[PDB]
Amino acid sequence: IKLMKAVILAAPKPLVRVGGCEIILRTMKLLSPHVSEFIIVASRYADDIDAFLKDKGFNYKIVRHDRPEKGNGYSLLVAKNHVEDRFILTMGDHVYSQQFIEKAVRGEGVIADREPRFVDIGEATKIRVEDGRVAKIGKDLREFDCVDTGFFVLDDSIFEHAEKLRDREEIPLSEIVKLARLPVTYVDGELWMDVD
Amino acid sequence: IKLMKAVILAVPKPLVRVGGCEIILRTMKLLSPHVSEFIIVASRYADDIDAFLKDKGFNYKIVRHDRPEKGNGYSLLVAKNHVEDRFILTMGDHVYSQQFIEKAVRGEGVIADREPRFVDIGEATKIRVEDGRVAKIGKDLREFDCVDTGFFVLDDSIFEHAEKLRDREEIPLSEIVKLARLPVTYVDGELWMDVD
């Protein structure tokens, strides 16, 4: 894909080694041929991540905040002034395959899986899709078409919707996505998994 | 396969949720149609595992020890009197796919991968195979044919070799395997990963 900025939410999860490599390192190594600069939104673990990433050959910036209780939606809002136009948004929770990354990188909006092969469908964030856009989202949906991977390809248009929730004690990414009525891109049955 | 006993060597690593399901739970659910009784060799986290597993519908037994510094090879030796003839041996720190389990259960000796698709080959326990048996093993091998999946199909004779290391401060499983000159069974390119 055309080079773009990669926002990785890390507001310890990213440093957990899966298959002899960390949840963040894996993602960064995979995204590197598609990414200019890595914007890591971190908080309580910002120093640990920075110390880890210094000796690694990536072009990164740690963007720090003090409100982890505000949720990942606030962590997205924190990045507003470090990105312009199109950018990748992913999590430091999640583990991805090259095959998943390769397809998701080419996507638009929410990268959703309608064939979750590895993850438990009951515990996953589900999405109800209407006219190719997010109609409903959440871990306890009754009617759903797909499952939320921790992957998105967003534009500046997001921050307008994310602003409308600034005055809420907790800002879930899902609520922004819902308000934004984000287009959905399907990357089906590829290897991906969250760690908790 | 013909029903047999399954030894699982065990925030505790087996209680870490990968894809919305705990490592031990994933492995237990998958092995359940091939398994009579489950034998969890645990130590510092024995109580946590037991409390987790009580409400789950499996036939399990917690076998406790006080020497975690002695290594996983000692954890195997601890299980000697809870198994007879053929039995499955796996780690509670490894995640497996159904496709991997299905092939591995039909296996004999060490279940090895000569096509590691989702693990870092540099950090993995490597094996050098001579005449279908383990010639060399270890994380820093120069010459190697495959990689150790933390999955084995053993008989009683393993403990005869495991006994020869009783008087060592540390007993690595790999050294027993080396001593035993274990046959190797290949399950290539299937999804499996260690969680550190």
Swiss-Prot record, chain A:
Top-level lineage group: Archaea
Biological role stated in the UniProt entry: Involved in biosynthesis of di-myo-inositol phosphate (DIP), a widespread organic solute in microorganisms adapted to hot environments. Catalyzes the condensation of CTP and L-myo-inositol-1-phosphate into CDP-L-myo-inositol, as well as the biosynthesis of di-myo-inositol-1,3'-phosphate-1'-phosphate (DIPP) from CDP-L-myo-inositol and L-myo-inositol-1-phosphate. The cytidylyltransferase is absolutely specific for CTP and L-myo-inositol-1-P.
Subunit structure: Forms a mixture of monomers and dimers in solution, with prevalence of the monomeric form.
Protein name per Swiss-Prot or TrEMBL: Bifunctional IPC transferase and DIPP synthase
Primary localization class, coarse: membrane
GO biological process: phospholipid biosynthetic process
Cell compartments where the protein resides: Membrane
GO cellular component: membrane
Residues that, per the record, bind CTP: 9-11, 13, 66, 102
Molecular function terms, GO-annotated: metal ion binding; nucleotidyltransferase activity; phosphotransferase activity, for other substituted phosphate groups
Region feature MobA-like NTP transferase, mapped onto this chain: 3-196
UniProt keyword terms in alphabetical order: Magnesium, Membrane, Metal-binding, Multifunctional enzyme, Transferase, Transmembrane, Transmembrane helix
Organism phylogeny: Archaea, Methanobacteriati, Methanobacteriota, Archaeoglobi, Archaeoglobales
Similarity comment: family membership: In the N-terminal section; belongs to the MobA family.
Keyword Isomerase: no
Keyword Ribosomal protein: no
Binding site for Mg(2+): 102
